[PDB]
Amino acid sequence: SETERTLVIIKPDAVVRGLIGEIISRFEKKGLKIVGMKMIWIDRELAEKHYEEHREKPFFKALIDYITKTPVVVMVLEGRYAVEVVRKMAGATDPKDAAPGTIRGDFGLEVSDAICNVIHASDSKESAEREISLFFKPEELFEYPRAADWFYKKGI
Amino acid sequence: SETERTLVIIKPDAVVRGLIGEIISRFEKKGLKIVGMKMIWIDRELAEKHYEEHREKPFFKALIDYITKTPVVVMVLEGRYAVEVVRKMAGATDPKDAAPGTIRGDFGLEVSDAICNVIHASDSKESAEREISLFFKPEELFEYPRAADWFYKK
Amino acid sequence: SETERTLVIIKPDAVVRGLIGEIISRFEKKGLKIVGMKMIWIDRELAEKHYEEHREKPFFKALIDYITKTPVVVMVLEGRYAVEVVRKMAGATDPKDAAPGTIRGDFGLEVSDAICNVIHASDSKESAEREISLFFKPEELFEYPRAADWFYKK
Amino acid sequence: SETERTLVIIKPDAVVRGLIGEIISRFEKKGLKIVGMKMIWIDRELAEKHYEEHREKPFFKALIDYITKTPVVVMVLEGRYAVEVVRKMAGATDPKDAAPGTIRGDFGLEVSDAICNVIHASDSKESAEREISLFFKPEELFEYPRAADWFYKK
Amino acid sequence: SETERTLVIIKPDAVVRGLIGEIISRFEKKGLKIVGMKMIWIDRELAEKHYEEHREKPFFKALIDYITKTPVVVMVLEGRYAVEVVRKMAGATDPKDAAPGTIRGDFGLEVSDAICNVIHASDSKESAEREISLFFKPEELFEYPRAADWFYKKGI
Amino acid sequence: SETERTLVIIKPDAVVRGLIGEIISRFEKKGLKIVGMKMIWIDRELAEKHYEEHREKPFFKALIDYITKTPVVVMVLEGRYAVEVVRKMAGATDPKDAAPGTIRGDFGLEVSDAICNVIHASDSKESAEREISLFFKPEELFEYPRAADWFYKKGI
Ligand SMILES: Nc1ncnc2c1ncn2[C@@H]1O[C@H](COP(=O)(O)OP(=O)(O)O)[C@@H](O)[C@H]1O
Ligand SMILES: Nc1ncnc2c1ncn2[C@@H]1O[C@H](COP(=O)(O)OP(=O)(O)O)[C@@H](O)[C@H]1O
Ligand SMILES: Nc1ncnc2c1ncn2[C@@H]1O[C@H](COP(=O)(O)OP(=O)(O)O)[C@@H](O)[C@H]1O
Ligand SMILES: [Cl-]
Numbered sequence: 001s002e003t004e005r006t007l008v009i010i011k012p013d014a015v016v017r018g019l020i021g022e023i024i025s026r027f028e029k030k031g032l033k034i035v036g037m038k039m040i041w042i043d044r045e046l047a048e049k050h051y052e053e054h055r056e057k058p059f060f061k062a063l064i065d066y067i068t069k070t071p072v073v074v075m076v077l078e079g080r081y082a083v084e085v086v087r088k089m090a091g092a093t094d095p096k097d098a099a100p101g102t103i104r105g106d107f108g109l110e111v112s113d114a115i116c117n118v119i120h121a122s123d124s125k126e127s128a129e130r131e132i133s134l135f136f137k138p139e140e141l142f143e144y145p146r147a148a149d150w151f152y153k154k155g156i
Numbered sequence: 157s158e159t160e161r162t163l164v165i166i167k168p169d170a171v172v173r174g175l176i177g178e179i180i181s182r183f184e185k186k187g188l189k190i191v192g193m194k195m196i197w198i199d200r201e202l203a204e205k206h207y208e209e210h211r212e213k214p215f216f217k218a219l220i221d222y223i224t225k226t227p228v229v230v231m232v233l234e235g236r237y238a239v240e241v242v243r244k245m246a247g248a249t250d251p252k253d254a255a256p257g258t259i260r261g262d263f264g265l266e267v268s269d270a271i272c273n274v275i276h277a278s279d280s281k282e283s284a285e286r287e288i289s290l291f292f293k294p295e296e297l298f299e300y301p302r303a304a305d306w307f308y309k310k
Numbered sequence: 311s312e313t314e315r316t317l318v319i320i321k322p323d324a325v326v327r328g329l330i331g332e333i334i335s336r337f338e339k340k341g342l343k344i345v346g347m348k349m350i351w352i353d354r355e356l357a358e359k360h361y362e363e364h365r366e367k368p369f370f371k372a373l374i375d376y377i378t379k380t381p382v383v384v385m386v387l388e389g390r391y392a393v394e395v396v397r398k399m400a401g402a403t404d405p406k407d408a409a410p411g412t413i414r415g416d417f418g419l420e421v422s423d424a425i426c427n428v429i430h431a432s433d434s435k436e437s438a439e440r441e442i443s444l445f446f447k448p449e450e451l452f453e454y455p456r457a458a459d460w461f462y463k464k
Numbered sequence: 465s466e467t468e469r470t471l472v473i474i475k476p477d478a479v480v481r482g483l484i485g486e487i488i489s490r491f492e493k494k495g496l497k498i499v500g501m502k503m504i505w506i507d508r509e510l511a512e513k514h515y516e517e518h519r520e521k522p523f524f525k526a527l528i529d530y531i532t533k534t535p536v537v538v539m540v541l542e543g544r545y546a547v548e549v550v551r552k553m554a555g556a557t558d559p560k561d562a563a564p565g566t567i568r569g570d571f572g573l574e575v576s577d578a579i580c581n582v583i584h585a586s587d588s589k590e591s592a593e594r595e596i597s598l599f600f601k602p603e604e605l606f607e608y609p610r611a612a613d614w615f616y617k618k
Numbered sequence: 619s620e621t622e623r624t625l626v627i628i629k630p631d632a633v634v635r636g637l638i639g640e641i642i643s644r645f646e647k648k649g650l651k652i653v654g655m656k657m658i659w660i661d662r663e664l665a666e667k668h669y670e671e672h673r674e675k676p677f678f679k680a681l682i683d684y685i686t687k688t689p690v691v692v693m694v695l696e697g698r699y700a701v702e703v704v705r706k707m708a709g710a711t712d713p714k715d716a717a718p719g720t721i722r723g724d725f726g727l728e729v730s731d732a733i734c735n736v737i738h739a740s741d742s743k744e745s746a747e748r749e750i751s752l753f754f755k756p757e758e759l760f761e762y763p764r765a766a767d768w769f770y771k772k773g774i
Numbered sequence: 775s776e777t778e779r780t781l782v783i784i785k786p787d788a789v790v791r792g793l794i795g796e797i798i799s800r801f802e803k804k805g806l807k808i809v810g811m812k813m814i815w816i817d818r819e820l821a822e823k824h825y826e827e828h829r830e831k832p833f834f835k836a837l838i839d840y841i842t843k844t845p846v847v848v849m850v851l852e853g854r855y856a857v858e859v860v861r862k863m864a865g866a867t868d869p870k871d872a873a874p875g876t877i878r879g880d881f882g883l884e885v886s887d888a889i890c891n892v893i894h895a896s897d898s899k900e901s902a903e904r905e906i907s908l909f910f911k912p913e914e915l916f917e918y919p920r921a922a923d924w925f926y927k928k929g930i
């Protein structure tokens with residue numbers, strides 16, 4: 001199955017700037033399905049867990065202050081090769097490097113002690129699975145049809 | 157006290173058509189704050205609690221089927237006179253009657269045995285209170301600053 | 311029978327300014343279905359047939375010149391109460407009078423010897439029938455499903 | 465003489481929130497012409513001249529603080545009945561009262577000790593004249609063709 | 619003359635999803651001129667003719683079912699180097715590979731038995747001429763000025 | 775300081791086509807700050823000064839006629855690495871080559887005797903300084919906070 005799920009976090013800079021809907025519309029427009037979503041306020045413990053791979057890096061602390069600065073919207077996107085697709089849609093990590101057309105390329109630039117880059121997107125299928133489990137319980141993820149789902153069915 | 161909170165439900169028809177982001181952006185652009193939000197799939201019991209006032213109407217059952225058809229996004233919006241403002245933004249109950257510019261006016265039209273109208277909005281501060289308590293726990297509602305909040309203070 | 315068809319003409323002024331896509335998207339977003347559509351250049355004879363009701367008005371000639379000025383896009387839209395809905399979406403005949411949110415309200419203003427107002431919309435089911443027969447053959451009108459058609463059925 | 469000019473001020477609240485381009489595009493899309501425009505920071509003396517009619521109102525001081533809070537974009541728009549049209553596009557003075565579709569309706573809501581409403585628009589041809597003379601010299605206003613100007617001539 | 623014409627087909631997935639206007643707006647915004655356009659329902663015979671170059675390929679049949687699934691909107695775009703430009707605007711054949719900013723990059727992803735990719739765009743000047751002739755008669759293509767045409771005239 | 779200022783000129787083709795607001799919105803959306811802006815009608819003398827580096831090139835004259843054809847909107851953009859960022863946002867000099875997503879990629883294509891390309895963007899920090907000084911007096915450039923400025927402050 002080419003169908004997979006990735007985790008997206010609309011970071012504090014996007015929420016504060018009122019970019020939630022515009023970010024969501026890009027995924028819906030692409031044809032990606034939102035199977036799970038909710039606004040939460042990430043606490044230090046969960047933040048460090050999500051970014052446990054950066055535990056031993058200089059910028060770590062700035063990154064924690066950042067993702068926990070205000071509530072965020074975490075969501076699970078479902079679709080064909082969603083992980084690489086959503087990663088492509090996100091753009092380069094540093095928004096100034098992200099190309100015009102991507103989420104970071106159009107909405108990101110300014111930074112604090114952390115490289116504020118609009119959203120988070122699972123980098124691999126493996127990370128996707130770990131991160132989705134860290135923010136969502138099975139009961140929060142749903143299976144339902146989007147309008148055009150019928151159109152793509154593999155013949156008879 | 158002009159700042160109030162209202163409960164909005166992005167109904168199954170909007171979720172299916174991929175209109176969640178567009179509806180949300182209208183509120184963010186208005187200056188309204190999202191203090192709570194989550195995708196959930198409402199069951200008949202909860203749906204009937206939310207729509208209690210319509211239990212004696214002919215269209216009740218079709219309304220419950222409709223609101224429970226697929227997942228929805230329930231959210232709480234905060235801002236100056238949020239309740240009447242969101243209701244103003246929503247438009248007439250029957251999409252064909254909603255004026256261009258409103259959410260129901262621009263996105264709604266087609267119906268089933270229920271009058272599909274994109275979103276739900278609390279009709280009073282009292283109703284919003286009741287509706288928010290049905291879908292959220294205080295721990296799911298947040299107090300934080302939006303970018304321009306400082307511009308209006310003092 | 312709430313499903314009806316209406317004839318819309320994206321007038322020369324909209325075609326020239328590159329507003330075809332924006333006008334079409336408003337209908338698609340409303341939930342209306344495009345069952346027919348083609349770019350054509352109307353000649354005086356056909357233009358006068360379409361505008362028969364105005365043959366005795368002072369602005370008739372300028373209206374024919376206007377509608378035949380450049381190519382236009384004629385199209386048929388299908389949906390619940392399509393006729394009154396599209397008319398609602400269009401707005402007042404004179405763009406300066408059309409409310410913000412409507413197509414004439416947002417895109418129209420400037421005029422010539424004719425009141426240039428972006429698009430034309432049938433004013434009744436009877437008129438739509440007549441107007442569609444003027445521009446299309448049954449073979450140019452289609453019956454097919456739009457993505458969310460299933461959501462409203464049964 | 466239907467072509468007129470009106471003075472619009474994109475107020476501090478719109479400049480701060482990054483709404484300058486969106487407000488301008490609404491006018492360009494309507495068919496209105498920008499014949500003058502510049503970002504400036506109004507001082508109390510000039511602000512009070514612009515708002516002379518309100519010197520005896522309770523909210524005067526807060527209005528001057530507001531309009532002089534940060535830089536603004538003052539601009540002159542030209543077009544058929546520009547004054548009433550822009551006022552129509554702006555919407556009710558109090559954003560909560562402005563209808564969806566209007567600039568104040570879509571972008572305004574929150575207030576301070578002043579009713580923050582995104583933009584200012586001359587209320588008459590006479591007022592526009594006065595207001596334009598306050599912010600521009602004839603050398604800052606231009607006469608040039610917009611892309612579709614030819615479509616409406618002759 | 620740098621001015622040329624290419625054929626664009628807003629495939630069934632775009633029509634069904636209500637993306638006709640948004641696709642048209644991108645070309646109009648670019649400055650391209652629509653000289654011909656119409657909604658038709660492509661029959662097997664015409665579809666196989668249009669895609670006669672893929673006649674001897676595996677995916678052929680899936681492609682035919684696809685382009686003939688529902689009505690489509692065929693249109694002729696005119697403008698400076700329109701063929702390469704419109705091809706660039708379209709994005710990579712498989713939507714998941716198309717870059718954010720292109721038509722396939724923003725609107726395409728999911729596939730059926732066919733690689734559903736929003737629109738069709740002539741790949742060469744030669745193909746453009748053959749395809750335009752296959753869908754449009756000379757009487758359906760017009761010559762008229764767009765608003766800003768006067769602005770680009772080559773001095774006196 | 776990563777913070778810098780670049781000069782942008784919304785050329786005559788953009789003004790005539792009513793693209794001023796859409797071009798401005800892209801920079802505001804990116805997070806760039808407009809510290810100076812005004813509509814002017816560039817005279818030959820100032821135009822040749824701005825493009826003094828192309829004085830000894832063939833296309834020079836066409837370029838002058840172009841930028842002075844109608845009023846333009848000149849503005850000063852402020853933000854982190856604004857010069858390279860705005861240059862990236864602009865796209866390739868010839869609009870047909872600019873990628874979908876950039877300003878020239880989405881709005882530019884047709885040309886006159888000059889390669890009409892929507893806007894001008896300082897190519898270097900050095901050019902930025904010379905050009906900004908050529909169109910703006912210190913009194914026309916302001917320092918004020920944008921809504922989200924507080925969010926990016928470097929911790930305590
Ligand atoms: N007459 C009706 N027939 C079928 N469904 C209806 C009817 N009236 C309302 N509905 C549905 O029930 C919902 C709630 O009804 P009501 O509260 O009266 O409208 P509103 O959502 O504007 O407050 C409506 O939004 C619509 O989804
Ligand atoms: N008084 C007028 N002077 C010039 N042109 C007019 C006038 N009234 C209407 N028109 C033009 O004739 C068209 C058809 O007229 P009418 O059917 O009355 O308006 P509508 O298009 O809203 O149904 C109008 O859309 C406009 O293009
Ligand atoms: N009652 C009020 N209290 C505070 N501020 C107000 C009040 N009324 C108006 N204002 C502010 O003063 C501005 C000018 O007032 P007025 O001219 O009456 O409204 P308008 O801008 O719609 O012409 C309003 O746009 C708003 O910014
Ligand atoms: Cl990138």
Ligand SMILES: [Cl-]
Pocket residue numbers: 146147148149172173174457
């Ligand atoms: Cl869908």
Ligand SMILES: [Cl-]
Pocket residue numbers: 246247248253254255258261
């Ligand atoms: Cl309404």
Ligand SMILES: [Cl-]
Pocket residue numbers: 016017018302303304305921
């Ligand atoms: Cl804000």
Ligand SMILES: [Cl-]
Pocket residue numbers: 400401402407408409412415
């Ligand atoms: Cl109206």
Ligand SMILES: [Cl-]
Pocket residue numbers: 147456457458459634635636
């Ligand atoms: Cl649909």
Ligand SMILES: [Cl-]
Pocket residue numbers: 554555556561562563566569
């Ligand atoms: Cl209003």
Ligand SMILES: [Cl-]
Pocket residue numbers: 610611612613765790791792
């Ligand atoms: Cl124009």
Ligand SMILES: [Cl-]
Pocket residue numbers: 708709710715716717720723
């Ligand atoms: Cl690509």
Ligand SMILES: [Cl-]
Pocket residue numbers: 326327328611764765766767
């Ligand atoms: Cl044009």
Ligand SMILES: [Cl-]
Pocket residue numbers: 864865866871872873876879
């Ligand atoms: Cl580029």
Ligand SMILES: [Cl-]
Pocket residue numbers: 303480481482920921922923
């Ligand atoms: Cl900001």
Ligand SMILES: [Mg+2]
Pocket residue numbers: 277279
């Ligand atoms: Mg109710």
Ligand SMILES: [Mg+2]
Pocket residue numbers: 431433
């Ligand atoms: Mg009529």
Ligand SMILES: [Mg+2]
Pocket residue numbers: 585587
């Ligand atoms: Mg006033």
